[PDB]
Design a protein around this motif. Structure first.
Motif, short mmCIF file in Angstrom:
data_model
loop_
_atom_site.label_atom_id
_atom_site.label_comp_id
_atom_site.label_asym_id
_atom_site.label_seq_id
_atom_site.Cartn_x
_atom_site.Cartn_y
_atom_site.Cartn_z
N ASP A 17 -6.57 -2.04 6.91
CA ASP A 17 -7.25 -0.74 6.88
C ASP A 17 -7.43 -0.42 8.57
O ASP A 17 -7.64 0.66 8.85
CB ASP A 17 -8.74 -1.06 6.42
CG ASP A 17 -8.49 -1.14 4.76
OD1 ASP A 17 -7.64 -0.66 4.27
OD2 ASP A 17 -9.40 -1.79 4.16
N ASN A 65 -14.22 13.52 5.15
CA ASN A 65 -13.51 12.25 4.51
C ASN A 65 -13.33 11.06 5.71
O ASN A 65 -12.87 11.20 6.62
CB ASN A 65 -11.93 12.54 4.33
CG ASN A 65 -11.96 13.75 3.14
OD1 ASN A 65 -12.17 13.42 1.94
ND2 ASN A 65 -11.63 15.03 3.43
N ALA A 122 -4.99 8.62 -0.14
CA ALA A 122 -4.58 9.32 -1.45
C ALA A 122 -5.23 10.73 -1.55
O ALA A 122 -4.69 11.38 -2.20
CB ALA A 122 -5.16 8.19 -2.74
N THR A 123 -6.32 10.87 -1.19
CA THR A 123 -6.88 12.10 -1.25
C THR A 123 -6.25 13.26 -0.37
O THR A 123 -6.08 14.17 -0.58
CB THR A 123 -8.59 11.94 -0.97
OG1 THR A 123 -9.33 10.93 -1.77
CG2 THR A 123 -9.52 13.18 -0.68
N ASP A 139 -7.06 3.40 2.07
CA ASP A 139 -6.21 3.87 1.23
C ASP A 139 -6.67 4.96 0.36
O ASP A 139 -5.78 5.89 -0.15
CB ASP A 139 -5.42 2.80 0.21
CG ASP A 139 -4.38 1.97 0.80
OD1 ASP A 139 -4.04 2.15 2.31
OD2 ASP A 139 -3.79 1.13 0.53
N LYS A 140 -7.71 4.99 0.00
CA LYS A 140 -8.53 6.04 -0.73
C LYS A 140 -8.45 7.45 -0.14
O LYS A 140 -8.42 8.54 -0.59
CB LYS A 140 -9.97 5.98 -1.31
CG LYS A 140 -10.21 4.52 -2.02
CD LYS A 140 -11.71 4.16 -2.13
CE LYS A 140 -11.98 3.16 -0.86
NZ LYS A 140 -13.31 2.76 -0.53
N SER A 149 0.74 -1.22 -0.18
CA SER A 149 -0.05 0.22 0.03
C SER A 149 0.86 1.39 -0.12
O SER A 149 0.52 2.01 -0.63
CB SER A 149 -0.92 -0.29 1.32
OG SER A 149 -1.37 1.35 1.65
N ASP A 181 -12.58 4.68 4.56
CA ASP A 181 -12.06 4.45 2.86
C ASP A 181 -10.53 3.90 2.94
O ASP A 181 -10.24 3.70 1.79
CB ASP A 181 -12.26 5.97 2.46
CG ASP A 181 -13.78 6.08 1.89
OD1 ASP A 181 -14.40 5.10 1.59
OD2 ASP A 181 -14.07 7.23 1.17
#
Lengths: 118, 110
Positions: free
Chosen positions: B14, B46, B56-57, B52-53, A105, B50
């Motif tokens: 996660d 946010n 990334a955001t 890794d999303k 990741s 979520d």
């Protein structure tokens, strides 16, 4: 651990695994039923419709109050979820995969970032 | 076709993102009040669920948010590798299942 003052992360993960093992056990016991007692497989399939494995102990408590034979199904799942977790589940493999997930990741997040900002 | 071990590992990845955000938030509260507030505002719009999303955001929101994201990533790996007590979690899993068996039994016949 900073930001934690109730359950530890370990205890939290531990409770998630517990429920996860209940769910594995139900999938295991379900499989064994499909050609050893399809009458009972159907009944288990009917129970699953209206009953959620999510809080697994609530699901089991409900299952064994459903009927005497459902109670015997619960006791089977209780035995199978104990055996699976203590004997079959590859704990260290799980740990290794989690490390790989975190490592990959990290790598992917950085790589896609660098690539798209150029 | 995903194994139980592999499913469990995805969840733990996660989960470690969640833990790292909690650790980082706590440290910022003591060591960087302004950065604490920026993380908290970002958290208002946010979801960490979520995974890794979310990261990334966070990375792309600004250079300040990128610093937050890099600290979270660093804390995530170090926590999972150095601090998280894997054998204890396992001993706790075993105990949960044992205690659950006993309680389900006692309560059904009592």
């Amino acid at each position: 651990v900073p930001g934690f003052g109730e359950a530890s992360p370990e205890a939290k993960a531990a409770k998630h695994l517990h429920d996860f093992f209940t769910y594995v056990a139900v999938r295991i016991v379900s499989a064994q039923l499909e050609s050893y007692n399809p009458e009972a497989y159907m009944e288990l399939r009917e129970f699953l419709d209206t009953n959620s494995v999510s809080d697994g102990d609530k699901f089991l408590a409900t299952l064994m109050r459903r009927s005497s034979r459902h109670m015997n199904l619960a006791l089977r799942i209780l035995e199978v979820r104990s055996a699976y977790a203590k004997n079959d589940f590859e704990w260290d493999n799980m740990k290794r995969l989690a490390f790989k997930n975190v490592d990959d990741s990290n790598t992917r997040l950085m790589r896609e970032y660098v690539l798209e900002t150029s």
